[PDB]
């Protein structure tokens, strides 16, 4: 039961889509931050529920 469950849970992470990676340049006044996405351009984007 532990083993079969894990092999399926890692598969579930693959199927659901990618991620990227930025660095916060500054904080803006709508509760969003100015990120520079390192391999592309900038995007201004909302905080998490843990952040």
């Amino acid at each position: 039961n532990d083993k079969v469950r894990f092999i399926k849970d890692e598969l579930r992470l693959l199927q659901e889509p990618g991620s990227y990676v930025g660095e916060v340049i500054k904080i803006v006044s709508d509760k969003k931050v100015l990120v520079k996405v390192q391999p592309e351009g900038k995007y201004i984007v909302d905080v998490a529920k843990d952040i």
Binding site: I25, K26, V28, S29, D30, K32, L34, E40, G41, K42, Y43, I44, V45, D46
Partner: protein
Amino acid sequence: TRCKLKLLRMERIKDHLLLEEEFVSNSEILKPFEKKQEEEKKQLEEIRGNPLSIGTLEEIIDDDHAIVTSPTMPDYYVSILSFVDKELLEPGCSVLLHHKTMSIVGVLQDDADPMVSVMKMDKSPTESYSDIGGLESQIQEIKESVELPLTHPELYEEMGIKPPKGVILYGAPGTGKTLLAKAVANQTSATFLRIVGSELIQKYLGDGPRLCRQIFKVAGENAPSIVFIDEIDAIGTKRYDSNSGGEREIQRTMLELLNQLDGFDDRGDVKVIMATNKIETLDPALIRPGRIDRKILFENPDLSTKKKILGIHTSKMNLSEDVNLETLVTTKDDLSGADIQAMCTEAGLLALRERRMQVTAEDFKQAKERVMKNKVEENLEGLYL
């Protein structure tokens, strides 16, 4: 004791009072959100969304539209929308575009860039006049040009000639022109922008010139101003490769700067400081002699000058009671203040090596030996003998 007590009195009441007033106000604001406010904030979210892509506003077309250029390679014809209008915008400002369907949904940047942050400074310079001490005659060419029309432009009007316009710091390394630029701008009482011209070089296209343009816009808001473009020599004329290039953008940047010298209105209120190693490290294509005014020629400290410079350094240096200033000056011949700076530091290193607190006269000779070492010339007695 009592001088403490009085300051203590004032500083506690002002800080503390303020904290309590801020602390209450965050609640007093949030409780009512009825009527105008809720409506306003709600509309602004709806027109917007998430994520928002940075943009730049190239121009406005007079039909409530605009031409914008994105960080992605495409450029786009968009509608002007939201609370931000074309009256509230101005060209060359960074603007928020909604990702899915490109339209200006707002602004929060308001022309804030990582180049804009480095250029900004509206505070007084760090060095004051004769920190920077001495090259007095050199200051007595920079001050004439830079301080004087800002202070009273009147003088030139009564004289009956056009005011000065810019200065070109050029000539010897190691005279501190990169420091000197600071010294003067303090004295005048004016705002001091500082930007390194190496950061106006970009491998992206049309970006080079945008960065040059931001400088004069800022300069005009905070006028009177002295703008230091540090190292115009570093735009230079250089080339990265000639088989994959890099030497196109250099020209377009150099050009955008020659135009706003005169072309940002005939004013000595938009002063420039151009520091350069020599003029033949620049693009040889140039604006005429009076447009840049006086070219300020730095040369080697003479015997008197390097006493001054040396003296500054050694006061800072601790535990040198066995050193006499004059004798250092006797043995040495004319040299930059740069090499005096090194000799004093090499002399701490030697005395730290030895493990002895004191710094001797004898010590200093060893440091002279090290600095002078590879300057040797035997064709001096090749001609003389």
